[PDB]
Every structure is written in structure tokens, then in C-alpha cells.
Amino acid sequence: MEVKELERDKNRVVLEYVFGAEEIAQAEDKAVRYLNQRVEIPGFRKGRIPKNVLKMKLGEEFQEYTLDFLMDLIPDTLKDRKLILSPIVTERELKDVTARVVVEVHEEPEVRIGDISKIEVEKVDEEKVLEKYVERRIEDLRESHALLEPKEGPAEAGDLVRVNMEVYNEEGKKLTSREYEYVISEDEDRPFVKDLVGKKKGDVVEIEREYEGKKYTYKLEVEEVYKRTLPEIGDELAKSVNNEFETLEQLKESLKKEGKEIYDVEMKESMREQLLEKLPEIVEIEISDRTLEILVNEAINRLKREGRYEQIVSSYESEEKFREELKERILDDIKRDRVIEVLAQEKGISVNDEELEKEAEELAPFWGISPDRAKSLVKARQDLREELRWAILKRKVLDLLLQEVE
């Protein structure tokens, strides 16, 4: 029983596991036990069929069983290695006084963080970002705070029409009701608003439009008309907060960096995702080309098992060329991941149950159940607590390398 690393191929070792005569026996009569309870031939009672006789029925078939119950001893050796792919047995052999097994062991590959500074992101102008958002938010704010009193006439340009909408099926059965508030302007027209210019309180319209499949009939009663002269950008707009605000500066000069709380995230996040995506360029790996082919073939044959293959491969250039093209994709994650993988522990980072929670709490809206139910889903399902672990871990690691483009 000697493990001889026959060969290494970067991050892929091949090992010769050899088993002397003593063990060859130990797995042989340990296969006659198992086989016997599978086998059934006249006379010989339940489990009691002598070894040779069994090896009589199987013969060359038997060799295999001896081998498997020697082959199970292999797993008890690569306990320490964290590998990309489950050990693959290239050849398994047995002769007179020897049972040889050749196992290929595809361990997770090594990487090398290059020049983390030599990486271009794209930081947008906080000032011009901020003023642009604010300008428009004053646009927004004076709208929803316009000076409105019910016009007694009709409805021309620039006036709010409160309309009560009812939706009926083609078969005349009301589906639901609603109320809306459309604002009109100069010579402008859009479905179910156009036909509602120069109408009064009480007056009705019945737009019959066809959607998706069936004919739908929309009853539109004008609930009220109101006059729409909005506050001009000043301190009279500071009525948005009833106490507090008294100057427009208090509105602007605030929002100018009130919505800085949004640039603080959307940007950080974008920056993060840029670096994440860009990461492979500075990262050298040593993956074996066999390890490439195998994960590549595994990716393709599963793309095959699903259906979304001939959708994608048969919509590019050829067949062999997508395989080449996918290979350049798989590698770059093998890259991105293992960079975080190391950098995580090698820069003192691990993801705890606590932050795992917060994460699933804001993820809950995205699954449709209670925020408290998500944690239960995390506690139950493993695949899911591991998926989140790695997801935060990434947030963190990328969150340092980026805060380090020096």
C-alpha cells in the first residue's frame, strides 16, 4: 500500500496506488461476502457460496469486485487535498501478486494576484451626478405639490384629470376598478388619455382596446378636474416639509448631498462588479489543460442535458469554436473565485452567521416570503447558506482590493 505521486501536471497529480498480495486477499473474500448476497445458484444456502465457485460464475467479472473493495481504500488518502474534481481512475489493474490502481487527482488550482493597482475602473462625477439627480428631484417635488383647485370648465394643456377606470372582459364581466390621475399638456396624446381632453366632472368615455389575447373594455369616468399651476423653484416649495424647511437652500443644499447616500452604494457596487469582472487580467493560474477540457466538457454536456445548447452553440460561428470560447469563460471564474478564495483567508476574512442573516433579510423580498421565514430557509437548506456565504465573502474581498487600487 504505497502512494506514489507518479506525475504532477501543474494543479493535477496522478497517483499510483499499489496493493500487495496480503490486501488483494483482504478485498477478495470481502467481495465474496457482498457478491454472495447478490448471487443465487442452486444448493449453496443464503450467503454460503464458496469463493472459487463464485469466481467460477463470474471469473473475469470477479476481478472487478476485488478491485472496487480495494479501490475504496483510495479515498482514505486524499482527505487533506481540496480538489476541483472528484478523483478519476485512469487505469485499474490486477495480476498474480499485485493490484495496481492509477488515480488522477484534480486539485483546486493555484493562482497569483499580480498588480492589483494596474486595473482601471470608472468613477463617475459625484458633483455632476448629484446636481443632475437633484435638479430632477425638484422637477419631481414641485409636481406632487402643485397648486390645484377644481377647474369648472373642460381640460386643455397642463391640468390633472382624476379618472375612475373600470376594466371589463370581452364577455362584459367587470374585472376590476381603479382611479388614476393623468396630467394633460400642449398638443399631446397617449392611449386612454388623449380621448379625455376637454371633458368635465361626471363625463364618461369607453375606450375598447385589444391586449395580449381578448378584447378589453375600459370605462373611464372623470372623477374631477383640477387646475395645475405648480410652485416655482423657491422657498414656498419648502412647504414639502411643513415645519423644518424655510429656505430653498435647505431643500437643495440638503438634497445636493442628501442623495449622496445613493451614490454611496450604486457606485461602490458598480465599482465592485467592474473589478470583479476585470479581476482575471491580473491573475495568473496554473490549471492543467486536462482539467480545462474536463470542466469544459462537463459544462457542454450539461448545456446539452438542459436544452439551451443548440440555442447558443447554433447561434455563434461553429461548434468547436464555442468550446474554445467557453473555455476562456470557465477559466476566468476559476480565476475570479480562487482569487477571493485565497485573499479571503489570506487577508483575515470569514463570513459569520450574523451578516448571513442581514443578507437574507433583504433577499427575502426577492423570494416572496416573510423576512423571518428566509432565515428559516437558510437554517434548513445548505446549498443556500453556502451560496450566501460566498456572496458576502466576495462583497468583502472585492471591497478591499478596490479600496486598494494604489
Swiss-Prot record:
Residue ranges of domain PPIase FKBP-type in the record: 158-231
Keyword Transcription regulation part of the UniProt annotation: no
Keywords: Cell cycle, Cell division, Chaperone, Cytoplasm, Isomerase, Rotamase
InterPro entries: GreA/GreB_C_sf, Trig_fac, Trigger_fac_C, Trigger_fac_C_sf, Trigger_fac_ribosome-bd_bac, Trigger_fac_ribosome-bd_sf, Trigger_fact/SurA_dom_sf
Function: Involved in protein export. Acts as a chaperone by maintaining the newly synthesized protein in an open conformation. Functions as a peptidyl-prolyl cis-trans isomerase.
Pfam families, sorted: Trigger_C (PF05698), Trigger_N (PF05697)
Subcellular localization, as worded in the UniProt entry: Cytoplasm
Protein name (record): Trigger factor
Enzyme class: isomerase
Lineage: Bacteria, Thermotogati, Thermotogota, Thermotogae, Thermotogales
SUPFAM superfamilies: FKBP-like, Triger factor/SurA peptide-binding domain-like, Trigger factor ribosome-binding domain
GO molecular function: DNA binding; peptidyl-prolyl cis-trans isomerase activity; protein folding chaperone; ribosome binding
Domain remark in the UniProt entry: Consists of 3 domains; the N-terminus binds the ribosome, the middle domain has PPIase activity, while the C-terminus has intrinsic chaperone activity on its own.
A GO biological process held by the record: chaperone-mediated protein folding
Similarity remark: Belongs to the FKBP-type PPIase family. Tig subfamily.
Principal localisation: cytoplasm
Enzyme nomenclature, EC number: 5.2.1.8
Gene3D superfamilies per record: Transcription elongation factor, GreA/GreB, C-terminal domain, Trigger factor ribosome-binding domain, Trigger factor, C-terminal domain
Catalytic activity: [protein]-peptidylproline (omega=180) = [protein]-peptidylproline (omega=0)
GO cellular component, one term: cytoplasm
